[PDB]
Design a protein around this ligand. Structure first.
Ligand SMILES: C[C@H]1C(=O)[C@]23[C@H](O)[C@H]1CC[C@H]2[C@@]12CO[C@]3(O)[C@@H](O)[C@@H]1C(C)(C)CC[C@@H]2O
Lengths: 435, 125, 108
């Protein structure tokens, strides 16, 4: 068991909690199951309250607030006490009393700490704050020594990625098939990917959640994996026969169904420009391999160029950009790049090019950015999940991420595409420890 | 109805040879894959070999990889498992099983219909 | 090859009680596990295919659950005709078929 605690400079109260950061389950947010211990000797006449404030901050505004009174517990609202509350009260003396908070959704992130930001105020951010204080009436003077205030965070975790894990296994095993030497490694890789494919066929893609189990989209989705398992079966048969090279040749056919899955279910973009003094268009197509990426995990960008003009492509630029619009009444909007690649690849006239570019966005190189969105060991702000019909005007800070692939052409705007993606965090007796 | 029948069980000297058949009735063999499962007296099940009869594909257990040979015919609806020199550690009952092909439900109903089993014994008495 | 182990070698219970048999696989098999029942002197009989689906004809007191590489078969209220040896099996592909060791149920 692990609980936290903060005392006061005058030592007239203490606040206990079971957690630091409270997860957000989209539909509901975990409650704040606090505990308060008070010494009635000084507070012989007065009372004690506990307050929660969700504010944006000298320019300062609030977004949500709620108050609860410890005693007398005669109007015992939320009378069902959670287990930890009862155990904490019973373990400690008879002067500990319970309280509970429940909150509607809001936005949890902060902004970077640099002089002269891009918004109103300095050292801004949105933070939650548990606070208890002692008095007789709710307007009197506040004695900081006889008070307390804590900070809690509304972290929000990424959904399950079983399908992504299955596809990652499939791709790694296909690679080790391609680099194999003898029959045993080929057999082991094929067995692993067969298991992964069968597992993946059960799961449902994020783009058909509202579609029914018997919808034709689901039928086509399952048909694709049926074909994939058949191709793996053919490759396994050839490998078990004894032919290693033929097994590899049969395994190469999986790239076609991988491409078919990408074009239908993965982020993709395509543009086309045909200049004057030219006859056929220039085509650029990119695609990311996953829709969800974790903080620090590399981000891989496919790129395809089929030039048909008389000009030549000089270099390709791959970048990851942060879009952070401030959902206040001022509706300020801005963006800042995070990661960047500057490969010097060239595309000849009437030629084709293809490569995979992998870049990792993280804060070490971005310490000097002026308005980059931070979490709250801090890292870049996780992408905000979309509103479920809620008003966007009072959300707060909505952060999202996009990826850009731009070509540069000699004898001279350029050509580029966007690929939105999601950057988030993965879902993971008693002694008091300092919070 | 659907049923599996096998024959050929007998006593053979070590280094001897014996043929086992898996006759199927009520269903054509070419629509299913047939396997051989061996159970020692007092031990668990063990898988021996199989054939497909649609592409001719065969495979064998690592214990009888080089010795046994499996083949089938369509007109007679029978699967034959030739036994080469026997090492006296294979004195066990022999069951025949049926497993359907991949696309759909028949693959998931693995070994839904078995046989009754035959006894092959190796000794020197 | 993929090895599959059964934890309880012998289990004892009376009629009407609850009994559970567990089975673990060394390598991931995506619900490609089946349970069989073998009375002494007869052929094996399939009970649960795909680790959760009850085959036709089998009574409804059987049920199987999968959690990762852990498969459990339960008989809610076993009867005198439920005493036999049960076996685990994986069927990911044709050439990779392995069976677990027996579990025996007796009368306490
Ligand atoms: C040269 C730097 C710069 O000045 C940037 C970054 O720190 C960096 C590039 C982008 C600008 C800025 C986003 O953040 C900036 O700090 C900000 O000053 C910019 C504006 C004024 C809001 C407009 C364009 C742009 O959104």
């Amino acid at each position: 068991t692990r609980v936290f605690k903060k005392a006061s400079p005058n030592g007239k109260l203490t606040v206990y909690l079971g957690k630091r950061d409270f997860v957000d389950h989209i539909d509901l947010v975990d409650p704040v199951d606090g505990v308060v211990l008070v010494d009635p000797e000084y507070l012989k006449e007065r009372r004690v309250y506990v307050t929660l404030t969700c504010a944006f901050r000298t320019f300062r505004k609030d977004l949500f607030v709620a108050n609860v009174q410890s005693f007398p517990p005669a109007p015992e609202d939320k009378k069902p006490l959670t287990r930890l509350q009862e155990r904490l009260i019973k373990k400690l003396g008879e002067h500990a009393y319970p309280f509970t908070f429940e909150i509607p959704p809001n936005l949890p992130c902060s902004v970077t700490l640099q002089p002269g930001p891009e918004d109103t105020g300095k050292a801004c951010g949105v933070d939650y704050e548990v606070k208890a204080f002692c008095a007789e009436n709710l307007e009197e003077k506040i004695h900081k020594r006889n008070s307390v205030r804590l900070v809690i965070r509304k972290v929000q975790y990424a959904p399950e990625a079983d399908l992504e894990d299955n596809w990652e296994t499939l791709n790694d095993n296909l690679k080790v098939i391609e680099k194999a030497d003898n029959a045993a490694q080929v057999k082991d890789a094929l067995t692993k990917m067969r298991a992964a494919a069968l597992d993946a066929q059960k799961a449902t893609p994020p783009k058909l959640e509202d579609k029914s189990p018997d919808s034709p989209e689901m039928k086509d989705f399952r048909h694709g994996f049926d074909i994939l398992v058949g191709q793996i079966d053919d490759a396994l048969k050839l490998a078990n026969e004894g032919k290693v090279k033929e097994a590899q040749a049969a395994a190469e056919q999986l790239k076609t169904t991988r491409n078919a899955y990408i074009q239908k279910y993965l982020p993709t973009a395509e543009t086309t420009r045909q200049f004057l003094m030219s006859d056929k268009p220039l085509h650029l197509e990119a695609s990311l391999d996953k829709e969800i990426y974790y903080h620090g995990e590399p981000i891989s960008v496919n790129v395809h160029v089929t030039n048909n003009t008389n000009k030549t492509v000089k270099k390709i630029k791959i970048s990851v950009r942060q879009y952070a619009d401030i959902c206040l009444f001022n509706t300020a909007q801005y963006k800042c790049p995070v990661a960047m690649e500057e490969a010097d690849d060239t595309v000849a006239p009437s030629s084709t090019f293809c490569k995979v570019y992998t870049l990792t966005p993280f804060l070490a190189n971005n310490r000097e950015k002026r308005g980059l969105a931070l979490d709250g060991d801090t890292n870049l702000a996780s992408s905000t999940l979309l509103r479920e019909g809620a008003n966007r005007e009072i959300l707060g800070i909505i952060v999202s991420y996009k990826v850009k692939v731009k070509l540069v052409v000699s004898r001279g705007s350029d050509v580029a595409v966007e690929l939105p993606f999601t950057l988030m965090h993965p879902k993971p007796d008693i002694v008091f420890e300092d919070f | 109805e659907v049923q599996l029948v096998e024959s050929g069980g007998g006593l053979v000297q070590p280094g001897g040879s014996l043929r086992l058949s898996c006759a199927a009735s009520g269903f054509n063999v070419v629509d299913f894959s047939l396997h051989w499962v061996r159970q020692a007296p007092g031990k668990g099940l063990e898988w021996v070999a199989y054939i497909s009869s649609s592409s001719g594909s065969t495979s064998y257990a690592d214990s009888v990889k080089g010795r046994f040979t499996i083949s089938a015919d369509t007109s007679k609806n029978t699967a034959y498992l030739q036994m080469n020199s026997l090492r006296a550690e294979d004195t066990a009952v022999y069951y025949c099983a049926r497993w359907g092909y991949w696309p759909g439900e028949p693959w998931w109903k693995a070994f839904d219909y078995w046989g009754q089993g035959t006894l092959v014994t190796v000794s020197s008495a | 090859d993929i090895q599959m182990t059964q934890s309880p070698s012998s289990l004892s219970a009376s009629v009407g009680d609850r009994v559970t048999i567990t089975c673990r696989a060394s390598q991931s098999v995506s619900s490609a596990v089946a349970w069989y029942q073998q009375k002494p002197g007869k052929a094996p009989k399939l009970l649960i295919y795909s680790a959760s689906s009850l085959y036709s004809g089998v009574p409804s007191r059987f049920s199987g659950s999968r959690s990762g590489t852990d498969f459990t078969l339960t008989i809610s209220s076993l009867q005198p005709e439920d005493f036999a040896t049960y076996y685990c099996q994986q069927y990911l592909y044709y050439s990779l078929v392995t069976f677990g060791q027996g579990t025996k149920v007796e009368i306490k």
